Amino acid sequence: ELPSLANAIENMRKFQNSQKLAQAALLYMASKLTSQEETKELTDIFRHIDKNGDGQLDRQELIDGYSKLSEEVAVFDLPQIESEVDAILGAADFDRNGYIDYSEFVTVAMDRKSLLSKDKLESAFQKFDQDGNGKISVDELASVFGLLESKTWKEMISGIDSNNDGDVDFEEFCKMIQKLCSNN
Amino acid sequence: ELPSLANAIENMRKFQNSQKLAQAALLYMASKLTSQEETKELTDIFRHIDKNGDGQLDRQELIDGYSKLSEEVAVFDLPQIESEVDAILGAADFDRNGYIDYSEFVTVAMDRKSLLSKDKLESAFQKFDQDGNGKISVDELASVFGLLESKTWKEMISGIDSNNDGDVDFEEFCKMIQKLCSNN
Ligand SMILES: [Ca+2]
Ligand SMILES: [Ca+2]
Ligand SMILES: [Ca+2]
Ligand SMILES: [Ca+2]
Ligand SMILES: [Ca+2]
Ligand SMILES: [Ca+2]
Ligand SMILES: [Ca+2]
Ligand SMILES: [Ca+2]
């Protein structure tokens, strides 16, 4: 009935679902392929901000602990700290639950040089490619997420499956994470 | 202190602010450069969904009026209609107030062939280019939005100011709307 409205919803779903897939792969790499030595500084920062020690950073902890993320802040700077905190939550809170867990914190804060090492990209790919055939398929994706509808599937791989063959090979997986991590 | 976290916040701001600028230009074109004859079908649909006649579509009106956006729906289909409505609101509710006003509805639903005509692109550009020098500047942007900080300014024009000269010329304005409207 309204093609521009149907295209608008589909474009947004394609963007949302392709970002969700790239975020899940990056979060796997950051939380499961990293060592304690390589995230020591992040851990000390996270532990200092996590006052109640519950393993998550709430909005109030992020406000009070802002100085550890940066340098001292002024007493009258609360409106801007609050604004800064909302941007941190916007950039790092992947599951939108209003908390930054350890995995989300390492994903956004870790040095890309160590997070994006070739060996981590290879191990991440090999975790998704369950049958080891060199391509990530629908069923392998469904299993990884603990579940897939054809339309939901096509939108996750939108702008990732560059050659459009319904699978994600190592070069397309590598480019997916690059697109997600790029400062351009 | 944490360069990947500072880059993550900046990348998100660049994306958010560049989308906000492109959306404001498209909404100007859809609501101010269009005729009643060219939006007649959209108007009849909007008026049919707007039951209380208040000029806006709330979430309940969108649910009840789903059939006008598409074809009859099944009695047990409410969970999916609700899901479909949330995607419409996600794609069309620009000011995030929880309502689709007439301007937002025309912006997402109008045929791109008539919305993206050369004359509408020229008139939209000429509205932003106040001094008529062939480029849209900071001050012209600030005036248009009814207000600009240097950082906020650089992020709005990020991925729009292709040649990086601090201004938006007609070719970069044309490409900005294309990027926003593209199904790729
Ligand atoms: Ca905590
Ligand atoms: Ca979270
Ligand atoms: Ca496989
Ligand atoms: Ca492929
Ligand atoms: Ca209404
Ligand atoms: Ca709205
Ligand atoms: Ca000008
Ligand atoms: Ca320019």
Please give the radius of gyration of chain A in angstroms. 19 Å
Tell the overall outline of chain A. Answer: globular
Helix and strand element order of chain A: HHEHHHEHHHEHHEH
What order do the strands of the largest sheet of chain A run in, or round the barrel if closed? Answer: 1-2
DSSP helical segment count of chain A: 11
Largest interface: A-B, 31 and 31 residues
* Biggest sheet layout of chain A: 2 strands, antiparallel
The overall strand count of chain A is 4
N-to-C terminal Cα separation of chain A, in Å? 37 Å
**In terms of structural class, how would the helical and strand content of chain A be classed?**
mainly alpha
Helix % of chain A is 55-70%
Oligomer: homodimer
The ligands found in this model are: calcium ion
PDB class: transferase
Keywords: Transferase, calcium dependent protein kinase, EF hand, calmodulin, ATP-binding, Kinase, Nucleotide-binding, Serine/threonine-protein kinase, Structural Genomics, Structural Genomics Consortium, SGC
Assembly: dimeric
Entry title: Crystal structure of calcium binding domain of CpCDPK3, cgd5_820
